Ligand binder design. Structure first.
Ligand SMILES: [Ca+2]
Ligand SMILES: [Ca+2]
Ligand SMILES: [Ca+2]
Ligand SMILES: [Ca+2]
Lengths: 80, 55, 99, 99, 80, 55
DNA sequence: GCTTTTTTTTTTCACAATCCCGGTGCCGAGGCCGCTCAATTGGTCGTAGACAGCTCTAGCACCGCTTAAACGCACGTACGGATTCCGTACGTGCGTTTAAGCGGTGCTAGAGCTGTCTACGACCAATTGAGCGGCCTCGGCACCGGGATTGTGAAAAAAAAAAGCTGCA
DNA sequence: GCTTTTTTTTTTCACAATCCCGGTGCCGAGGCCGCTCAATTGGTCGTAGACAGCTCTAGCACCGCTTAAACGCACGTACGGAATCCGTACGTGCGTTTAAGCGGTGCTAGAGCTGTCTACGACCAATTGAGCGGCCTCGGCACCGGGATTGTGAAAAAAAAAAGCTGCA
């Protein structure tokens, strides 16, 4: 239905485990989906802008890397 | 130097992202220099809040 | 003699496990389709280098893990062990993500 | 009988007053001496433009006012009305100012 | 001299009031002086760095504006 | 435009720093644009948290 | 001092996580090619900037008085935090269902390159008005005093409410 | 049923504080002025990127199999949040103390500008070797298996606190 639901409750539980969380309200799984969608929205918007500016129909890794740098979340290992 | 020592500690002759992540985040100064940087396939430092443990 | 672990014990095992590992924790395909779905809302018929969608995931997972660490402290700060939506909201408020 | 406001009522007045106003709330001289004092650790016999000290003050107070907002949210989050050192500390930990 | 005490209790309370604070622990005041000092050390060190690079013996407002911009704390109105 | 309105509403002819600040922070978009910017002699928006108010 | 419940502690079993074997196998580090183009060498030439030398801004310090602001105490309300208490929201551990992932094939959009051409920007020099620093008016704002309005809080009414008293089919 | 008692609730009623008003007088917004410097106009050369035309990379479609992860659900423990309770930390307001802020004059470090000159980078061309993709091979790391070893809990029976019982001082 929504691809957002493809980010499942068990995947969310794993992420919060890596972030040291022990116990998790039921409500969080939607809340998380909200945040994550807004995160992607913002990063993808700027990446595609770089794509549209490069006159390409293909979003490169570099497009994302420049988008993630602009958003203050610099990313190493993907052609930085 | 530090990531190499992290590889030596895991019985690996090859440095991988994790070894760099462990080098950078256990050293105070490097951690601060790269505070706003994400290291791909780096993971996080093993760290569980004290109140979450049993007695 | 059916064995049972108390509530929290497996959680504590999972934390320990996942902190030790570096492998991406969202299933890659549902993620890829979500990236493609959201990308449509800005431009139609968009192609993605596989590495581009991988960057986006590596990025998405680090940020959320990090946010969970900050959220977890907000819960603990309010004398709780259970994270809740308001914990995430305070965290992002203080980080300067939302107003 | 001698008149008395209840605890909390003047605190709110003081808020309304200072949020309405824009003037600096630290006394200019004790601040200037502090600026000169810290500046000695790095280089001795330093002069300061007057505007540089005002800039430094404008910046300090905007930082601290702002920090008190975040702090006040952290106290509220733990169902308290009183700010404490742990509130400031958590706020700063989330902002990334402190490890 | 020993000027950090010159950041008085009442002046800290005043800032906190502008920050919407109603009730304030007794421990806040020394805690705030620490933060304020840390804040100043960092801003000033970079200011002074700029001053020294310009071969001057007098800190300018630009030195401070430039330092503040370096701390992600941009200031408008002092030649910024 | 917005700083003038804040002046007129203060019964003043000339824009001041406050007027700019009010104008900027009361507009969602400008507040975003200048989220990490400090307007000197601006002060803050009146905003007392509801839980702190009497009953 | 005793009894009568619940704690807290101490002492067996269980289950995962791990080290140490040993062996196996896969591919990507690792390093060797053989150009190649991008860094070294050499040389000439401009101007960016070190330095002197001067002006004259603004930073500093110092006195002296007024008064607001800070300082320290007495007093007391409401706050923070400790306890007890209850309901069910979560974590656990089963079975059941589903589609992620793997490996493979098959197409072709479109990334990404080479070569040709020229419109569009650097460059220069003469021209010369928009924009600067300096300076002088004059009306908006800072400030004051005084009255009008707002808002809090104590203690004294109106009303509601919640128990004790009487009769009561 | 109704009287009595009691907390709420609600209204009066003083008093502090904050808001508007006009009156005053001072100082920087505002605009004018005359000069200077940077923008424009109108030259020429040069190439940087638009464009076509080609290659062939890697991004998409699709299928079929093997589990592994996702999904419900039965069950109960441990958490959250509500409620009550209580000592004292913090707010409020008082007299007393401090020193900031005010204006002023007096002094001169040094910020800043101007003119000189030269060592240092730019620009160019001929040289030439370090770094380039492109390949090809072997050992370092995934993986499985199994069987210690060590760790880390749960549970179950024991070894101490909690409350409750007196009656008793
Ligand atoms: Ca309470
Ligand atoms: Ca002018
Ligand atoms: Ca070209
Ligand atoms: Ca190579």
């Amino acid at each position: 239905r929504d691809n957002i639901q493809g980010i499942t409750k068990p995947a969310i539980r794993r992420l919060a485990r890596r972030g040291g969380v022990k116990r998790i309200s039921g409500l969080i799984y939607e809340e998380t989906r909200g945040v994550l969608k807004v995160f992607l929205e913002n990063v993808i918007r700027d990446a595609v802008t770089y794509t549209e500016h490069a006159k390409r129909k293909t979003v490169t890794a570099m497009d994302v890397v420049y988008a993630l740098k602009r958003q203050g979340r610099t990313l190493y290992g993907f052609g930085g | 130097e530090l990531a190499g020592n992290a590889a030596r500690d895991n019985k690996k002759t090859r440095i991988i992202p994790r070894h760099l992540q462990l080098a950078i985040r256990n050293d105070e100064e490097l951690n601060k220099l790269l505070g706003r940087v994400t290291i791909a396939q780096g993971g996080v430092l093993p760290n569980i809040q004290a109140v979450l443990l049993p007695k | 003699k059916p064995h049972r672990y108390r509530p929290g014990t497996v959680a504590l095992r999972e934390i320990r496990r996942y902190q030790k590992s570096t492998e991406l924790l969202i299933r890659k395909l549902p993620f890829q389709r979500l990236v493609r779905e959201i990308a449509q809302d800005f431009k139609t018929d968009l192609r993605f280098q596989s590495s581009a969608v991988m960057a986006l995931q590596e990025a998405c997972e680090a940020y959320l893990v990090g946010l969970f660490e900050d959220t977890n402290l907000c819960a603990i700060h309010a004398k709780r062990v259970t994270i809740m939506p308001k914990d995430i909201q305070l965290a992002r408020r203080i980080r300067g993500e939302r107003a």
